[model samples]
Target: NLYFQSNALDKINRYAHGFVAVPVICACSEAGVFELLSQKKSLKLEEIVEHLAANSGHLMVAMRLLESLSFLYRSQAEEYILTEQSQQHQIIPKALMSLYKYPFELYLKGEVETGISNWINCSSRRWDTENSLLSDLLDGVLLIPLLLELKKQNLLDESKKIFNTLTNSLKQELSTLFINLGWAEEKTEGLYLTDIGRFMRDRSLNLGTTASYAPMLLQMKELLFGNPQRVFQRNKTEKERHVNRTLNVVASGFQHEKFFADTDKIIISIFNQQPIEEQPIYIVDMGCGDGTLLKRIYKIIKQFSARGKVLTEYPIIMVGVDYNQEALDVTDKNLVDIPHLVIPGDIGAPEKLLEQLKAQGIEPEKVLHIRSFLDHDRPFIAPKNTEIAQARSQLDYQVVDVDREGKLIPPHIAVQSLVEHLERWSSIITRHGLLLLEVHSLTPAVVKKYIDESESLHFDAYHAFSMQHLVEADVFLMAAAEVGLFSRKEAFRKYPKTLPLTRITVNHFEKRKYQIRYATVNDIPNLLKCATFNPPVNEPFFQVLLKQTPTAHLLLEYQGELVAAIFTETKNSNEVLGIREFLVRTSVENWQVLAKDLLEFVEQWGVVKPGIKEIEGLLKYHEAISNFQKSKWYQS
Candidate 1:
């Protein structure tokens, strides 16, 4: 795929490595890995583990990470040697971390006699051989928010950096941060971003997208051995102990808009294909954070696709779905430009989402579904039965996963859990397709081999935490296959060139299954979304017919899409089941054929559960509700 690829992995990975790597550095530094290694000069896994009383398995992981970052080197065979670049306990992350605190505090609450972070106070925030990138990682975490806030306050966007407009103590510390990074300089009048400073400023989202995971970077010791939930999980009582949800949403939105640009282009191409009737009617964005990407797809369709040219006649509809109330609230505002619906939906419950959609009168099966970096964020269900025993990654290292119950989960259960989670949506998106972008976990073997190529280790560390399951792409894609979803070969892509080095995947996948089932109370919202009362029947009235279990309210679906439905209710007095509603989404010429088919289904339904003495129904020839119905007491 490459004309001539670049080997900039060393530079790229160094920045990303800092987030999770910083924790590893601090943990080992404090635990005497560095001190012990420096004393021994060279030691193998077993020797190092025994000497330091470390878990050999976990210690090897830590050593390999340091070796990858050039803090240590694996000499010919038996042992790891500290590189000349290494320094004993050089970075515990606090020295520089504290330096950025004043700006972060000021940025959050809204200081330098002009309470600027003293350059003298930041004496430890200096650059050196081994830890500069490590420092860059810490530097970027707060700097991302500070710079963005500065740009918003009209400071960094232009050449001249202005301290004039900011709150009294804000800009000075931020000015010092940029200056220390060599990104800015002090002129006689004030400060200004340098050429390289402007360059990083323009591409701020690179670090911005990652800065939200700062706590995870700082807390590796506990996450690796102690409880991760204590640091990562959010309950009603408190916010995420580590992550910032708002910054996560903002950074994620901007990052996806760019990462999925490749995905978006291909998706828009599909929407503009021939045979216009085959196109999806609705744009359903699940886990639609802030509705930003949701709006992009609409604008891309309306502004960029052939579908855009016919909007007046086609009349596009979009639905933004998110489980978080905060997300849905902002989604409603972000999508105000489009006359669209913003509603709640969960990635793990497509059937429930289908119900919500049907109640709202939209047939989800016929919609073009999209989601980003979800699928791995759903609540974990302890895998009751295992369908898959192992993935390739399991062979090299034993993966440690502790569930919310604080019990160890074997690897097979985690694989099966992912399979079942994706199966829920497999049948629904068959008609159009599920255009998706997701996080992926790489194997330890892969990380050790190509650590400089990507931030795979950091991602794996993050996802290994409870309630987060970032599976390998090979395993993830195969799981999708287990559920009948196949990725389109033309569009499947890994962000990095090598699959092993990849932390993300963007792809288009589809299912192929013919299915039909009973319609229930859950189907209410979807009915409301799509059903016209003169519109098919609306909510409250259908509540009556929808209640009868044995009563036939059936949906006919093919390739996981709705073709038609026949709603019937049993009358207790007569012991007769009669069709109350006949709705057809697909065009039909033969009334008798549909009429003959539905009544036959009703009779079969009565036999399956029993109670009905007779069955009756009607089939419409577009407008005529023709009862080809015949009823007789057939009680046995």
Candidate 2:
């Protein structure tokens, strides 16, 4: 074995890609490329593409991935042949080739959700599988340790400082691993992060939030067929941990700066809405991770916002809350100045938190509420009110969870729980609006399609196994509206301008309405037509949905306005039916049922409301609409 050069490097090379590796292998296998090679001696790439009706470009990329794994060989004759190693790795690629179906150029350029949405609407294959889930967990476990090691060694920090400390034997071993992963390269000084490594470094810490649940993932026996033993419990002394609370909060702190930068303006703008004397005296952050967000937001309000100008006379109190005792202690230690308080409060129970504040002689209603990527992690309460069930959904997110025992959670019931969860906090944030930064999920089909390109899968699978719910972005918005809390359309924001893969969203939710303004709707790209509207249903059908109520604008947090108004239109009966199903599939709320009934009435009447005759008026502006969806003009 030594003579043959059996090195640990072999394991390291395979280490980084099981997440990327198996999928590439599976896609090629599923494409019958291996079967074809097995049958023919060897074939030219052209011949393979032509015979299989594959996009020659994507087929080549797929081939490169396979060739990298030694599963296939490119011959001198410009033909492709399988290697003996290919037989050694005879895996039935269970992954879908959703992305390859589109032009490879478009995939590289991005923004192809239109084509994907049609597939999402029509694909019979259900998304979500334990294999994908496990792969994501596995990827996080292997990569995060090395990524974090690199960070501490200062090899991959933002400064890009060279690490002379690599002289240490342990650090040197770590350096070799980074080199193998192509995340770092040996430089004149010692080692430094490659461009690829730096990109990985930025997101590597976020994975710890999922990796923290490694214990839960290990309980697959109970997760698959039986109930787990109170692993979700957060006892400080208990040997068994639900989630590595300290690690989870630390990772959350890493995300807070990026998470808060976008939401801070939303907060600053809200804080300035009233005179300093009349404004809320306290800004409360739920799930205040490490006190990083609280400290930063206090600085922001004091430095840039109007409230900061009057700080001496009307000082704002920094109030941070978290269920994790470690988070509270860290917050207490972190807040060195600025009259601040870190109290224990679970996000699920607003009343308990309010009671605590009331005892301190602080009026709870005057507090501004905020939390980042926390609502989804609130303890899952079985829906007491199940009347608001989602009729259909784009992402069928059923996964092994604790609250429901080992059973896969029902998507609608999960949606209902989220709706009620928002309802709990709705009353608390009534004054200055609840500012939230939350993560959402793209279906497994969507994730598999672009698995190699994004980390949504890593984030998605982690939340799933940890007993957290990751709803689609739209589903979350609709749910908020059901509890009398409406999102200020102007302040609503989400990442991934491409609607098909929206994972993170921030919204300022309020119970009141404000004058809504419709932005120019002429900038939408044509490719988004498929992405925005369900096929067979044209643009006119959406006109009816968007303009449901003129005042239902996103700015004022009024429900059924803004996007709702601009989206409401009727084309053909079947087209109207498509729009109906798409809406129900995309969002779940009490209003959705009412909206469904309204559309059903339209499907029967077969009439278009006056002045809103053609969808061309709005479809031409799909880019604007998409930008609106992604928080372009929406943020105040």
Q: In each prediction, how many residue pairs overlap at the backbone (N, C-alpha, C within less than 3 A)?
A: 28, 34
Report lDDT (Cα) of residue 573, candidate 2. 25
Prediction 2 TM-score vs. true: 0.59
Each model's lDDT: 0.60, 0.54
Stretches of candidate 2 exceeding 4 Å from the true structure: 1-144, 150-207, 218-222, 225-227, 230-236, 239-243, 386-404, 513-636
**RMSD (Cα, Å) of model 2:** 16.3
Candidate 2 on 1-636: residue-level lDDT in tens? 333222323222223344344444554565677788989978997788678765443344345445544567667675888887676334232422232223322322243343233222222121222343233323333454445545644555643444553335434544555565556786585467675566566656755655455555444333332344454555676644756667766776676567678877786786677777777788888888677778888888888889888888888899989887877888899988878998999989998998999999998768878788888878788787644343323223332233434334556677778877877887666567787888876544444444444555445544554567777665576567556665565676666544235667777777643222221122122212322333334455334444443211121113443223223333442123122322222232343333333333232112221112223323233333344345232211
Worst ten-residue run, lDDT, model 2?
604-613
Q: Give the per-residue lDDT digits (tens) of candidate 1, residues 486-591.
A: 5665667665642324466787886644223455566666555432213346677778676543224665554555545667666764357676665544233453
| Model 2 residue-pair collision total | 34
